[PDB]
Design a protein around this nucleic acid. Structure first.
Ligand SMILES: [Zn+2]
Ligand SMILES: [Zn+2]
Lengths: 430, 427
DNA sequence: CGCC
DNA sequence: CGCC
């Protein structure tokens, strides 16, 4: 006797009582107010979904994979305690996302605070412990057969990775369990958001996850235990990689969608000094420092968009006038694309310095109106098959300009070509 | 070649440039921030959709059907102007919705101001005219061949209805055009949200609108030009009505979803005196009076939920703590259901008085625990073809959820339905 | 009662 | 450039 939540992707999702008492907290329900695809909704109107229902799907998928593993191979000693912590890990892996998901830690906090190293996964670890303490979950955890001190750290390890054996939460015989929720070397997170995102985007999904689950086993490579699929399933995995490619080309890397993300990020930056969120002890925080106090971060969601847009505050009129140009669909303009040469990749610490480098370049022929750094938006688009074990351009740089007259736009495209020449990046096309 | 919006229900939606220039206004994009099912999202997580994408679907379908009618029967004199005005009517039928959709005008405003008579359709008319003047749409209309005065009133009439022939926007040789956007109860708006809601709820819809449009035509019935389908497709409509029945019993009238709607309304009522929305000329409005100025109403959306939830103001803690019991899933509890069979139905004007009645009734059998009116919620759920070859439910919830309060509440409910001659509640 |  |  356990609770059921109806889901359009997975149908009925049965929830162990302990999962229910993690979901029914303000820290988890927070995910109802953060859109999964960020500003992609302003391009795909079917993409209204938030991290909340996605994380229900990931928790469900995680639990159905290891319970299927434990029933096909009982020799692997998979307690139902192990299933409860894998389910909790999938449920909370996204707890640390901020407004508009990957826009927040992928762009905004790099540009507002290049010094800090911040990821949503660290956010999830912090928010997970804030969730556990504020709602008295540690007693409820042992009541359902979990050992909190070792099992909370097991949960945290599944979300954020390691600190021979780097993991303290599970022994090395249960190594396979760490490949389920987030495998950073195919995980149940991409299973859900591949199906969910195409459902809302109108893209077809030819990956069948339930057919991957039923024929999946744990095999041995390296003397290490891994999750492995049948030779009969390579056609399915060719499909998994194809829809991942179409989701990226068509949605995640959409040209208009990515510009709008950087427009929202611009409005946050110009609002960052004047917006206050009350955290612990009345301490007031800002959008960029809310990540330092979880009580404030809990109230940092996509709501900050509408609060800026609905504001009367005169100090917020630069930010408010950017969000208002999104409604009028007068956006930054697409100058061009380029990719870093070799395996070299740009780093978040240097994002802020990118528009100043482009303005400093000297093009071949002079034009009267000259551009400064603030006329440029430099957009760094990162994406992140034979590592799959059976048995029987990763970075894009796009440049936009906030000037939309034809003479500014030509000039902007001659500071982009020179910048590429200077850094020896691939030459832009048309 | 024109702008294209990819939609999960309809695929590609081509939009006339004029439609693009009303969509890309703050008054229309406002619908991105109003959930289609209101609080149903707190029960069905797939139901994250908003009025914006629904209204895109209605403008598309409206133009599809009218273009199909003019293509099969050119005798009917259907110009571009008529289809552009039918499309605009479909796009803007829902402009007047408030936070959480039907909750706002169906419950909140009756309880916050039982005096005034308000509907979202009157809102859509008011907001449509605010959209047109603030965004300089009247010249753009002229550009594409529209006559503003008669074509704007034609659009308003399609939304909210008229004031022999009651309509001033089109003659009766074009009588059929008023049957498309809002109606029999078969309009292109219910086609979209049946498909859209079932897509996001996981309910299955096998009603085919695309072939109902293809075999539809206008016909003569009792002195009148009306839209008609082949008697061939009674089978298509039997399925449409089944999915309407499924969406109502399973989703629209869900017991917990409706309880949460009345919890959100309760927090709105307790926040209504302390929330300020700035309208035209800096003039400040409240949640219940923002409907009086469209410049303020533009900024009244579901965001107001999170403004209450994230507030520090001490005057907003009664409201904030109701929304906090939604997050903790400690909700009002279901006491019972009844119907006024055989009786004058409850009216929005009487809504406020209903809890005081329930708490004033008390059976021949007394018990120790005794409730007051604010401990009760009274929820009034209202339900509301030519071919060619339970009206009202009242549910009662209690805000005290201990076993002894709930037992009493169920004995004030059983005796309030004998006092009102409503049907006896069953178990 | 995020199962009608 | 809410079509890739
Ligand atoms: Zn995820
Ligand atoms: Zn509608």
């Amino acid at each position: 006797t356990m609770k059921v939540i109806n889901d359009p992707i997975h149908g009925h999702i049965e929830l162990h009582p302990l999962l229910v008492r993690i979901i029914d907290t303000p820290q988890f329900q927070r995910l109802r107010y953060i859109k999964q695809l960020g500003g992609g909704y302003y391009v795909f109107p079917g993409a209204s979904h938030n991290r909340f229902e996605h994380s229900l799907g990931v928790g469900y998928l995680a639990g159905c994979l290891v319970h299927a593993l434990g029933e096909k191979q009982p020799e692997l000693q998979i307690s139902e305690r192990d299933v409860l912590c894998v389910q909790i890990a999938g449920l909370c892996h996204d707890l640390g996302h901020g407004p508009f998901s990957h826009m927040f830690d992928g762009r905004f906090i790099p540009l507002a605070r290049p010094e800090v190293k911040w990821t949503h996964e660290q956010g999830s670890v912090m928010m997970f412990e804030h969730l556990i303490n504020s709602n008295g979950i540690k007693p409820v955890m042992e009541q359902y057969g979990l050992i909190p001190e070792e099992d909370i750290c097991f949960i945290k390890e599944q979300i954020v990775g390691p600190l021979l054996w780097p993991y303290k939460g599970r022994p090395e015989n249960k190594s396979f369990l760490y490949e389920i929720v987030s495998n950073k070397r195919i995980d149940v997170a991409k299973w859900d958001y591949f199906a969910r995102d195409c459902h809302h985007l109108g893209i077809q999904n030819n990956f069948d996850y339930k057919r991957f689950i039923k024929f999946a086993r744990v095999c041995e490579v390296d003397n290490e235990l891994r999750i492995c699929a049948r030779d009969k399933e390579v056609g399915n995995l060719y499909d998994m990689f194809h829809t991942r490619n179409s989701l990226h080309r068509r949605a995640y890397q959409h040209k208009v969608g990515n510009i709008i993300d950087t427009m929202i990020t611009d409005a946050f930056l110009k609002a960052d000094d004047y917006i206050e969120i009350t955290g612990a002890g009345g301490k007031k925080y800002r959008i960029s420092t809310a990540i330092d106090d979880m009580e404030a971060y809990t109230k940092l969601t996509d709501n900050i968009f509408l609060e800026i847009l609905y504001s009367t505050d005169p100090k917020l009129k630069d930010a408010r006038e950017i969000l208002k140009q999104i409604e009028y669909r007068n956006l930054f303009k697409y100058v061009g694309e380029t990719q870093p040469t070799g395996q070299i990749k740009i780093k978040r610490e240097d994002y802020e310095s990118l528009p100043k480098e482009v303005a400093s370049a000297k093009p071949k022929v002079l034009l009267d109106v000259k551009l400064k750094a603030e006329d440029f938006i430099v957009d760094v688009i990162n994406m992140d098959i034979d590592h799959v074990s059976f048995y029987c351009a990763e970075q894009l740089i796009r440049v936009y300009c906030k000037k939309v007259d034809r003479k500014s736009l030509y000039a902007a495209r001659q500071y982009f070509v020179q910048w590429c020449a200077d850094r020896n990046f691939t030459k832009p096309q048309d």
